[PDB]
């Protein structure tokens, strides 16, 4: 069974023994060297179309928490930018640190943010998520950095349900949540071909990482850090530092949408 995690004994430096693609040619995350990324005029406008998004449930999976969406129809989709065709939102989750100075997966000129939001989408040409993760263009993940400052009003409903999903395997109803409240003003981005950042580390992802971070309050991120990796009744292991560090860029170029 899967027994990877983020500890010293099961963390990122161990994953390659059960998931050898961990040492592959298009792994994520990466450091975004802002001076080496090149503006790409070929990029078409990015279209985030979440008006009809239908959230259903929030789940503590022992690695992070997922806010899950009804992806049985094109209710919430990502198009444009580097993407060919339509990518449907299935879930979002975060990665965060034990302290405000770390937590993001991607870095920007080696800077680590306090957290990183991942909105996960699958290419509808492949019919469902499981088939999409067999394809090099199966997924698109919209990544958004979080810095600590003023509160993000649209995050507070997520924060407030976390007490009900403290431990691994717990879920709660989470209907009528609008993911548009988690976006920054600007859709300026960097993009590159990469992978899932957790096992199974599959190389299916077009990454779209927004330049502008959102601000969340210290009190909001402190509540993330009260979650548990462990199950109910087990010794407490706070869910913190659930991020993979930057991986080798190898034969890739990062493109910028902005000049
Ligand atoms: N390569 S990996 O998936 O990161 C991994 C690392 C450590 C163990 C040992 C876990 C145990 O005691 O069950 C199992 C699997
Ligand atoms: N952090 S990330 O790259 O946005 C990501 C997205 C989805 C999975 C789910 C993988 C699975 O279904 O096993 C794993 C990791
Ligand atoms: Zn993620």
């Amino acid at each position: 069974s899967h027994h990877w995690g983020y500890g010293k004994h099961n963390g990122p430096e161990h994953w390659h023994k059960d998931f050898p693609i961990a040492k592959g040619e298009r792994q994520s995350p990466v450091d975004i060297d802002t001076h080496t990324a090149k503006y790409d005029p070929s990029l078409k406008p990015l279209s985030v179309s979440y008006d009809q998004a239908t959230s259903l449930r929030i789940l503590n999976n022992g690695h992070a928490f997922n806010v899950e969406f009804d992806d049985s129809q094109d209710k919430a989709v990502l198009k444009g930018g580097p993407l060919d065709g339509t990518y449907r939102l299935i879930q979002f989750h975060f990665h965060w640190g034990s302290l405000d100075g770390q937590g993001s997966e991607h870095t920007v000129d080696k800077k680590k943010y306090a957290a990183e939001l991942h909105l996960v989408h699958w290419n509808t040409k492949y019919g469902d998520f499981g088939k999409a993760v067999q394809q090099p263009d199966g997924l698109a993940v919209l990544g958004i950095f979080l810095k600590v400052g003023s509160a993000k009003p649209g995050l507070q409903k997520v924060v407030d349900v976390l007490d009900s999903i403290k431990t691994k395997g717990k879920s709660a109803d989470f209907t009528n949540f609008d993911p548009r409240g988690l976006l920054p003003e600007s859709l300026d981005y960097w993009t590159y071909p990469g992978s899932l950042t957790t096992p199974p580390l599959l190389e299916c992802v077009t990454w779209i990482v927004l330049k502008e971070p959102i601000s969340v309050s210290s009190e909001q991120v402190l509540k993330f850090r009260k979650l548990n990796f462990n199950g109910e009744g087990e010794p407490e292991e706070l869910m913190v530092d659930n991020w993979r560090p930057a991986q080798p860029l190898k034969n890739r170029q990062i493109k910028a949408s902005f000049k």
Side-chain angles (χ1 to χ4, degrees), residues 3-4 9-11 14-19:
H3 285 301
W4 65 268
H9 301 290
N10 64 0
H14 293 280
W15 292 354
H16 70 101
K17 292 178 275 164
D18 290 276
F19 304 94

Side-chain angles (χ1 to χ4, degrees), residues 140-252:
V141 184
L142 181 59
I144 304 179
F145 295 120
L146 279 61
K147 67 181 267 161
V148 173
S150 299
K152 189 70 164 177
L155 183 60
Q156 191 61 33
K157 290 184 175 184
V158 170
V159 165
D160 287 331
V161 80
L162 298 182
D163 276 334
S164 72
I165 60 153
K166 180 179 85 182
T167 54
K168 175 177 54 172
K170 290 199 78 197
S171 66
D173 188 274
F174 204 68
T175 51
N176 299 293
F177 182 77
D178 186 355
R180 296 176 301 174
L182 299 176
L183 308 181
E185 290 176 2
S186 183
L187 293 177
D188 286 348
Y189 68 86
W190 299 283
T191 183
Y192 77 96
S195 71
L196 302 178
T197 69
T198 75
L201 299 169
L202 300 173
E203 291 181 335
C204 319
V205 183
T206 301
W207 278 95
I208 300 167
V209 178
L210 300 188
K211 175 167 175 36
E212 187 175 5
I214 63 166
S215 294
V216 304
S217 65
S218 181
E219 298 81 350
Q220 289 178 318
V221 70
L222 283 163
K223 289 183 180 178
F224 286 17
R225 301 185 190 126
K226 295 182 51 253
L227 289 164
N228 284 188
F229 290 123
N230 55 278
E232 181 180 7
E234 298 173 358
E236 187 167 46
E237 298 169 70
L238 295 174
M239 182 180 282
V240 294
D241 295 318
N242 59 350
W243 51 278
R244 190 189 195 191
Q247 301 301 305
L249 190 62
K250 305 203 161 165
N251 190 223
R252 296 181 285 181

Side-chain angles (χ1 to χ4, degrees), residues 91 93 95 105 118 120 129 141 195-198 200 207:
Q91 55 110 317
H93 61 274
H95 306 262
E105 299 211 298
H118 291 162
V120 183
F129 180 93
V141 184
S195 71
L196 302 178
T197 69
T198 75
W207 278 95

Side-chain angles (χ1 to χ4, degrees), residues 75-114:
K75 288 172 164 231
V77 303
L78 185 66
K79 309 182 50 186
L83 303 173
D84 280 356
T86 299
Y87 290 69
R88 192 175 298 171
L89 179 66
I90 180 170
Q91 55 110 317
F92 71 76
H93 61 274
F94 304 79
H95 306 262
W96 61 93
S98 51
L99 321 144
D100 298 346
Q102 65 198 50
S104 65
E105 299 211 298
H106 295 89
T107 57
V108 177
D109 299 329
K110 300 290 175 77
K111 177 202 169 84
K112 293 172 168 89
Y113 289 87

